[PDB]
Amino acid sequence: FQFTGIKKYFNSYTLTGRMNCVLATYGGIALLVLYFKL
Amino acid sequence: SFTFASPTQVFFNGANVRQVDVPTQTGAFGILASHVPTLQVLRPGLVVVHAEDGTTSKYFVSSGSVTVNADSSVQLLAEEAVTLDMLDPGVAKANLEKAQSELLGAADEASRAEIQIRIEANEALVKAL
Amino acid sequence: RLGLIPEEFFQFLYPKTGVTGPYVLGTGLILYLLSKEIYVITAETFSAISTIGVLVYIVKKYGASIGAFADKLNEQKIAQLEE
Amino acid sequence: IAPTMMGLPIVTLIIMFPSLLFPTPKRLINNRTISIQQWLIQLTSKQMMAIHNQKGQTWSLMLMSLIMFIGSTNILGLLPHSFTPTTQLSMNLGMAIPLWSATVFTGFRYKTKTSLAHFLPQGTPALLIPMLVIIETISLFIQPVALAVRLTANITAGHLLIHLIGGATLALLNINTMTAFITFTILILLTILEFAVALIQAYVFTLLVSLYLHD
Amino acid sequence: RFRSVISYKTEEKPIFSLDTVASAESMSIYDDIDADVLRNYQEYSLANIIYYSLK
Amino acid sequence: DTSTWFITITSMIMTLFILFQLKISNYSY
Amino acid sequence: VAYWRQAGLSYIRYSQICAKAVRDALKAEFKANAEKTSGSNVKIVK
Amino acid sequence: ASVVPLKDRRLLEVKLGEILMRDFTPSGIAGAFQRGYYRYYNKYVNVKKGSVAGLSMVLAAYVVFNYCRSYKELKHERLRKYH
Amino acid sequence: IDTAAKFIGAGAATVGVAGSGAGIGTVFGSLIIGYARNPSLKQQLFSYAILGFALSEAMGLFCLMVAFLILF
Amino acid sequence: IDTAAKFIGAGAATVGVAGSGAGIGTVFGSLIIGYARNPSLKQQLFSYAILGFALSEAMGLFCLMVAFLILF
Amino acid sequence: IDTAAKFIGAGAATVGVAGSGAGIGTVFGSLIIGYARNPSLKQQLFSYAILGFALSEAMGLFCLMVAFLILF
Amino acid sequence: IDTAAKFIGAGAATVGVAGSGAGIGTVFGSLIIGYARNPSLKQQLFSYAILGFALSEAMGLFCLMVAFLILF
Amino acid sequence: IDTAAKFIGAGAATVGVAGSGAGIGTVFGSLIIGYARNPSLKQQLFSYAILGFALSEAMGLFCLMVAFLILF
Amino acid sequence: IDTAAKFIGAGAATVGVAGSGAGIGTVFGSLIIGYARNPSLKQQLFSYAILGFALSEAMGLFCLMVAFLILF
Amino acid sequence: IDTAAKFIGAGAATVGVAGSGAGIGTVFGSLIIGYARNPSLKQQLFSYAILGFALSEAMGLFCLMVAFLILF
Amino acid sequence: IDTAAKFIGAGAATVGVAGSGAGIGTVFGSLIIGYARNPSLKQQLFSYAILGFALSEAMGLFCLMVAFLILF
């Protein structure tokens, strides 16, 4: 039940903080490029 | 040899404080009993006098002159120099905020600059207090 | 220093001749360290950080940490107590 | 001739370890070891919140956790055989991009037009306007990579220098005076290597400046 | 000028209020003289001498 | 030696961020 | 040269303004001394 | 299983770096770690200031764990025991 | 061997971008010290600071473009 | 032979960061003296110092990126 | 090999523009501090800055022409 | 050939740390004039001086990291 | 192989042009702050500024004479 | 061949240590200015100057240690 | 090939005179700002400025002499 | 080839003289500005400049010695 401890902060700052999808896309594209090299 | 006195009250006459900081118009300066001779115009701020003994003094001053000659004789002349205790921090903040409010009121460039002098003096007062 | 070292050596010799304790384990730690140096421990890049970093930590603890304890107790606690 | 190795062990246990170093008691009076942590948190929070002075101060309660985490991870690396998680480029890359994206998207969420207008430095010569615009946008896109590298490179370089000088000392079976001098150099360097905390300050302060500029 | 309860002296003191006349060979030794700073200093010195003469 | 791969190193840091912010939220002045 | 200087404000006016600010900063207990220092007696004949 | 690790962590916290918290506060004030920095079996650790015994133990455990991890890569010098 | 020389020339050519960094640091520090005296940042002061920064960065990126042309 | 050329080119491209170090040193050195003259650091007096660091370190990281591209 | 020499020389020759960039930065920064000291900006304060910038650019352009001669 | 490239590339790359030395010299020099103008040594005068020294040392070690990579 | 050496030697000697640019930028910049301090610009102030610029350019051209000599 | 590489690297590496010479020069010059303003040799001015010179020479000697590693 | 090595070494050694140009530019600029601050003209100010110029240009000339010795 | 490598290394190592020239220029220029700032030049003010020269040019001569040793 640690979710409710920072639940307000989570959606309070991730409206733009939770853009880790961009990081995941960049990492996946880099891994695909390296596998093409691999 | 420190000569610090207002037009009405005298703080130090020939005192070997050997360390005085003044709120100069251009900025801040520090006397070290050997500082290069110069003439410095005071700015709204506080003069923290550091005596040769470990004790120091803090006086908020008005505009004036910092005259340090080739020798150690420094004639600091402040128009309205008082200790910080005599002032009121609450009145300080109130005057600062009122002056900030009235800064745009003075349409004249000279008058707005005068109110800017007022807000600068109040900000230095707030920092000192 | 040197005089204290002779006194400590005499005290150890007195315990060494008899017991005066429940099988002092300091010799055990010394022997374990010697065996580790002989077989397990490898003296490679040890002086790099194993000695230097620990020495810096020792200097910090024997130095400013005494004042840090004061800065904790006599400053943090008493402030909220007074408040 | 010893090959330096910033190996990759099971990362999760090592990375989670600095968190356990800070206990949080639910008492009016702390344990005189969390108390110093609380005082440091307050002292740094005042410095970080001084500049913002906006509704973005909500971000400060997360930036405090960020600075604490980076400092704890980097300070623990000074141990003999500690593996710095920040040595690997992966996690710092995964930290720099999301936070910069958060800053720019927060800027584009409120007063979006003026946020993009921050490229204009209030006029400037019109003859060089396109050059200034392309320069500043390339700098803005550079900023995440810059933030990641300015941490990764020097965090790795500290360990690299420590390893090099330590190997020099170990291989120096010659005159013991030179060995002692090199060991003194090692200790001086490690005292300087304790300034990795200043690197934490630089990273977090640059992030704060970016967020304040865009919000 | 007040000398004593019964004696006084009518004293004359020069005033170099002009900025140019303020600058001289001695001002070379004095640092941060500039032009505006020395002008404001001279004006304040004029006020000070007026006050002293008044007293 | 040189950093490659970049898969699970960048994944545990988010969980550690959650843990650290939850822990420091309890901290108060 | 500043915002006040070279814009119509004499340095004496600068001193007057900062001195008045300092006097107003004083509490009412020391306001008598500030009033004493404040000189408005001299008038103008033209 | 994990409940036992949590209990062990709580016991370690109480022993070193320790309303009802008044008992816990007095326990921390006593500083059982301060008395024995190297546990009851030994005398003390080299650092002798700041009541930092528990943090020193935690750091030493982390260091030895990382040494166990790194022992695979490193290799000795001589098959015979070192001097 | 020609590609080898292209590589070495590209490596040596981008060195010229160093002067841009030193110039930008100098001009920004000078902006700091100038603003320390005259509180007129929202004036031609910051305008000329941006002008100098842009000129230095443009010189550095011109050298970088020359290096890229050498590489390709 | 191309690997050798990449090595030497990356080595040469690395030296282009010296200007970045000179610039950051100059800008921060002017920052300290600017604060010494005027005790208003929390303002643009330090904001522009940070901005100058950000805009001057760009050359060094650009040159090192070029060096890495040559190396890899 | 001759083209290889041309490439390496052009890469080495173009680095002389870095000093021009540093001089440009110094010129603009000193212009900043000069205007901070005295507000006679529209006077020869800007003219001397233009004069310094033009000479630094001329030196950099001469280095660029030397690099072009090496390349061609 | 490859080992020769490693050596020459490292020798080149380590020359880029000179600019960081110049930067630390500049900032630590400016420390002394800041202290002379304002005797507030324990304050931000020395705090930001240490910050600048750390930043320039970072700019230098992050350069020599490339030389270390080249050598190994 | 000598003709191959000509281009690399010319490129290596061209680096000295950077110092001349830095020097001329510094001297011209000081002229700006000098004129800022003292309005006696057309005097030995500007005279010695021209003197320093000419000496720096003479040093730079003297350096480039080595490149022109080795190339031919 | 590798001995030739060591010679070339030692030639190139030692220049980085000499670039720190400008750093101690700036330190001593700022010391000159500070002592000119507030003459007190026993004050923290000399200590700060010594610390800055020591840090610059430490950067130089670390570059020289890299050079020695190149040699050995 | 030995002649080629002498040529490239002379080209490399020619760089060490750029710092002489930077130093003479800086010292002449200093002389400018000092004369601006102090009307003293033909006193130790100008003599020491000429002395510094002579020393820096002599160091540069010695570097160029070493370059010539490598060349011949 | 060994003589060739020693030649190119000595030529490369002579670049370090550039730092010495810049440092000497800086120290002498700060001596100039300090003398203009205060008439205490004949005091420890001049001695500090002498020491700064004797350190920066000492580093330059150390680099020159390294170049000579590589040459021989």
From TrEMBL, chain B:
Domain of life: Eukaryota
ATP synthase F1 complex delta/epsilon subunit N-terminal domain location: 1-81
Shown residues in whole-protein numbering: 39 to 167 of 168
Quaternary structure and interacting proteins, as annotated: Component of the ATP synthase complex composed at least of ATP5F1A/subunit alpha, ATP5F1B/subunit beta, ATP5MC1/subunit c (homooctomer), MT-ATP6/subunit a, MT-ATP8/subunit 8, ATP5ME/subunit e, ATP5MF/subunit f, ATP5MG/subunit g, ATP5MK/subunit k, ATP5MJ/subunit j, ATP5F1C/subunit gamma, ATP5F1D/subunit delta, ATP5F1E/subunit epsilon, ATP5PF/subunit F6, ATP5PB/subunit b, ATP5PD/subunit d, ATP5PO/subunit OSCP.
Keywords, sorted A to Z: Acetylation, ATP synthesis, CF(1), Hydrogen ion transport, Ion transport, Membrane, Mitochondrion, Mitochondrion inner membrane, Transit peptide, Transport
Protein name: ATP synthase F(1) complex subunit delta, mitochondrial
Protein location: Mitochondrion inner membrane
Assigned GO CC terms: mitochondrial inner membrane; proton-transporting ATP synthase complex
Keyword Membrane among UniProt keywords: yes
Automatic annotation (TrEMBL), chain E:
Entry superkingdom: Eukaryota
One cellular component term from this protein's GO annotations in UniProt: proton-transporting ATP synthase complex
Residues of the full protein shown: 165 to 219 of 274
Protein name as catalogued: ATP synthase subunit gamma
Subunit structure: F-type ATPases have 2 components, CF(1) - the catalytic core - and CF(0) - the membrane proton channel. CF(1) and CF(0) have multiple subunits.
Entry's localization field: Mitochondrion inner membrane
Keywords, in A-Z order: Acetylation, ATP synthesis, CF(1), Hydrogen ion transport, Ion transport, Membrane, Mitochondrion, Mitochondrion inner membrane, Phosphoprotein, Transport
GO molecular function list: proton-transporting ATP synthase activity, rotational mechanism
Function statement: Subunit gamma, of the mitochondrial membrane ATP synthase complex (F(1)F(0) ATP synthase or Complex V) that produces ATP from ADP in the presence of a proton gradient across the membrane which is generated by electron transport complexes of the respiratory chain. ATP synthase complex consist of a soluble F(1) head domain - the catalytic core - and a membrane F(1) domain - the membrane proton channel. These two domains are linked by a central stalk rotating inside the F(1) region and a stationary peripheral stalk.
Protein family (similarity comment): Belongs to the ATPase gamma chain family.
Signal peptide: none
TrEMBL record, chain G:
A GO CC annotation given for this chain: proton-transporting ATP synthase complex
Record organism: Sus scrofa
Protein's cellular compartments: Mitochondrion inner membrane
Entry similarity comment: Belongs to the eukaryotic ATPase epsilon family.
Main location: mitochondrion
Name assigned to this protein: ATP synthase F1 subunit epsilon
Keywords: Acetylation, ATP synthesis, CF(1), Hydrogen ion transport, Ion transport, Membrane, Mitochondrion, Mitochondrion inner membrane, Transport
Record bears the keyword Translocase: no
Listed GO MF terms: proton-transporting ATP synthase activity, rotational mechanism
Domain of life: Eukaryota
Automatic annotation (TrEMBL), chains I, J, K, L, M, N, O, P:
Entry superkingdom: Eukaryota
Family membership noted in the UniProt record: Belongs to the ATPase C chain family.
Name of the protein in question: ATP synthase lipid-binding protein
Compartment annotation: Mitochondrion membrane
Organism name: Sus scrofa
Domain V-ATPase proteolipid subunit C-like per the UniProt entry, residue ranges: 8-70
Entry's transmembrane regions: 7-33, 45-72
